[PDB]
Design a protein around this ligand. Structure first.
Ligand SMILES: N[C@@H](CCC(=O)O)C(=O)O
Lengths: 200, 53, 172, 95, 52, 54, 172
């Protein structure tokens, strides 16, 4: 039987840190600066005198510890007392509330798109797909078959083979295989199934 | 039949089914382990401080 | 009272035995293969064949950035280090029959037991990751490792608690 | 002076369990190594949860039954599904 | 009709998503920084109120 | 706590999927779909010269 | 204990030097480009071409509702503001050698450093938001700016710590 032949689709090896891919480098960088600045400002405003600085626990280290609890949404042991500190807290809370949601949404979308790939199956839709090209051997019986058969799908196949250039034809099986191997994904070839079964 | 030399195909169980592989989130565990490993040294230097007060 | 010393030493001994057995047995994985397809069982070092004419045949495993991660699986360094450090910890508390009045033995052995335990999690993660690089089902050695890890995590808490109690009594 | 703090082993297990679930845990490490240990654990749980919810959301969006078998080799490995040709059919003689 | 080429009308090839740009969320950062800027001023006006 | 963690996640996921399915409603257009669509049906007046033309 | 003056006096000058150098160098970005494409380096103000026969050729940058945002990128006022405020902050501690017992010349030092840092942050965000609209990567100046911001923060923190300490001991 005549057969179609294609390259293997390359296996999607995971990365060691692939989990970051939804969110892009620059955001990951800028979070650090926002964290540092927020913590420093919270400290400074907390420990300027209330009129006496012994009246609150918000030392530098405690100020760094509060903010990290807030970003990962795991609550905290202590809460800022003054109005200004409460303002700072509310702002940081809104920021994290936006970021975490965006991250989750994007990851879900990224996985979702992957499911409906629907790869080429039965190969008959090469009469309907056009992004992927396919070749045939010169002077082969196949070259006669598509002129000489007249079934509608093979008619449009032969029309494609007529019109497409650089041409579908090739002089040798060896260099046709070389073409398929180099032209990965975008190119295909027609051959006798016995020969494919030998090669593959 | 002697000349065929590639036959690796998913059998018994299948990679493609649905679930996230361990590899897909592998990275996180290394960060965790390193985090836990670091905190020991902090306590050790805290010991080395107080032990000659 | 007191006899918790016996319990902790027994626990350390048993963990050491389980760990060395696990490292020394070809019972990590069942899979299809051939000892150059048939059901095949694997240790970390070697591939050995059952369920056929070659039953009892063995061969050395095929060991062959992630370019550098390759050697990490091949060396299996974390198992070995875990065993060595558990040995260190066990032998330390065994010395506590003498050289007393210093109590550093117990704390040091505790840290050894804890670090030994952490090592095995890395080993498991490494192994499970590398083998993905089907139909598989785990052999008994994997569970001997898990049990060793659990017992190591148990014993160290009791040893640290013993150190604390035997030291705190200086407060009264 | 030892045991001047809540973090016995039982309470430590309790805290780490509540921390995984994103629930109110009252006690605080108050101390550097403990805070260090606390941080990474929150990061881990955040990532795990987000992954789970995303993947389940994707899973419910598109469905695919998966055929149980495809090949004559599978029919040689048959579990229970019996099979046969037409009777009196020349395919039977061919077999 | 024999010269029909553009089957891309039917989305004959499928795009793939990419990560969010900084632009896609940049707005929130401005809000945060403005909030901090305001937050500093209150403390000074409070201290001047309690200056007598 | 475990019960809560399962339920709330499932709810969020389902709501997202529900809203997502609606977006690809893609209603019939340009009479081109009637080349392939067969869940719909269509027809004409009888004796109209539309029938002769077709 | 007293000595903290010796440390906080250090970093501000360094941060100033780093930031002004970063403003003064044509190496924030590697990209394709032109100097009337080829691989290219740029600063805030101008572009110069390399990796070809024209290597060393230069031109002033292309300066060209949200429309009014463009002015912010075109001016790059925020770096300049941060530099001037940091200068003022350093002059605060330079002043506080005289007029002692006031204690209040120090106070404003931290405020200047904080505000300069916030400006630097905004400047970076604006620059990225503008330019990202090609296998690019960042030149050393960018990291110089980041480090400058970090050290300005640290110096501000320790200066506020000094004003906390030195004044409190008068208050009993
Ligand atoms: N058509 C076949 C009968 C069906 C079969 O062989 O299974 C024949 O001519 O004998």
């Amino acid at each position: 039987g005549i057969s179609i032949m294609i390259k293997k689709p390359q296996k999607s090896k995971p990365g060691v840190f692939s989990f970051l891919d939804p969110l892009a480098y620059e955001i990951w960088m800028c979070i650090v600066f926002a964290y540092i600045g927020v913590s420093v400002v919270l400290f400074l405003v907390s420990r300027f005198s209330p009129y006496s600085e012994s009246t609150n626990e918000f030392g530098i280290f405690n100020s760094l510890w509060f903010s990290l609890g807030a970003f990962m949404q795991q609550g905290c042991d202590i809460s800022p007392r003054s109005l200004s500190g409460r303002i700072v807290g509310g702002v940081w809370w809104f920021f994290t509330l936006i970021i975490i949601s965006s991250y989750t949404a994007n990851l879900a979308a990224f996985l979702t798109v992957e499911r409906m790939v629907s790869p080429i199956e039965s190969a008959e839709d090469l009469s309907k797909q056009t992004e992927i090209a396919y070749g045939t051997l010169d002077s082969g019986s196949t070259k006669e078959f598509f002129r000489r058969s007249k079934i509608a799908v093979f008619d449009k196949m032969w029309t494609y083979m007529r019109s497409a250039e650089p041409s579908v034809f090739v002089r040798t099986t060896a260099e046709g295989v070389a073409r398929v191997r180099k032209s990965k994904g975008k190119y295909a070839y027609l051959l006798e199934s016995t020969m494919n079964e030998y090669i593959e | 039949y002697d000349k065929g030399e590639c036959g690796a195909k998913d059998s018994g169980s299948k990679e493609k089914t649905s679930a996230l592989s361990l590899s897909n989130v592998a990275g996180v565990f290394y960060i965790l382990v390193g985090g836990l490993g670091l905190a020991m040294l902090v306590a050790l230097i805290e010991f080395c401080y107080k032990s000659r007060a | 009272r007191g006899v918790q010393m016996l319990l902790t030493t027994v626990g350390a001994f048993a963990a050491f035995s389980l760990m060395t057995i696990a490292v020394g047995t070809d019972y990590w994985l069942y899979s299809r293969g051939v000892c150059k397809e048939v059901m095949t069982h694997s240790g970390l070092w070697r591939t050995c064949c059952l369920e056929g004419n070659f039953k009892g045949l063995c061969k050395q495993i095929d060991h062959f950035a992630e370019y550098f991660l390759r050697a990490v699986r091949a060396s299996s360094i974390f198992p070995i280090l875990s065993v060595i450090l558990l040995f260190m910890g066990g032998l330390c508390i065994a010395a506590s029959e003498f050289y007393k009045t210093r109590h550093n033995i117990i704390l040091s052995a505790g840290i050894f037991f804890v670090s030994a335990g952490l090592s095995n999690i890395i080993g498991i993660i490494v192994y499970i990751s590398a083998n993905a690089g089907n139909s598989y089902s785990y052999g008994w050695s994997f569970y001997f490792g898990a049990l060793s890890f659990i017992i190591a995590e148990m014993v160290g808490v009791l040893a640290v608690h013993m150190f604390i109690d035997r030291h705190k009594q200086l407060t009264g």
